[PDB]
Amino acid sequence: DREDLVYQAKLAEQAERYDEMVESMKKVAGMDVELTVEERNLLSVAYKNVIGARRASWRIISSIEQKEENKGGEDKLKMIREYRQMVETELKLICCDILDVLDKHLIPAANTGESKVFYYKMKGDYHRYLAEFATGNDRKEAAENSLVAYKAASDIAMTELPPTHPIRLGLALNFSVFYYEILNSPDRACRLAKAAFDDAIAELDTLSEESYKDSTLIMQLLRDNLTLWT
């Protein structure tokens, strides 16, 4: 039945029906077991597409708000705002859902370094998405939580994954993105990104057969952001 949930997850993925792919993988996370690499990727992809869609809508709607803000079209702005807010509510719910699954099931039942780094990194990511559109104190809370999860993923990763491991690199990438876009700290964003790249270049022999394209790509992305930021 675990094997069926995974199969249904795959069916849902091919059909591009991500809500159900989330439902399938939630159930598998609810079994309080260590998930396979496959099942971690399925969960991740399920939740990324579902959140991805709203994040895309939120930006489109913000852009239009900003347009109507500069033209002073106040009648439309009421509608734009109500609509942004509805989407923010979806984003909150989706993020709270996975954050909960992480705290109550995935993180507790994790037993390898790879999965622990993955889950705390995920938790950092999802708090960071809450923070992308939050204001004031809510923004603060998501920032503190996101920092705390990214530090926890970092502590375990630093001691337990080669610097080439794509999860470690992915962690560096996003944690440096966090510092730049959320803490508004280009100096730390760049020191972190530069170091993670450099550490993987110093040990390129440690690249796995399984994940060299993933790693390569992540390092390309590290490079692209350093450019962007300088």
């Binding site: 990511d125 992915g170 990438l173 996003n174 993105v177 730049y180 876009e181 992540i218 992305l221 692209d224 952001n225 962007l228 930021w229």
Partner: peptide, 4 residues
């Protein structure tokens, strides 16, 4: 900024 691009994330993974």
């Amino acid at each position: 900024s691009i994330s993974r």
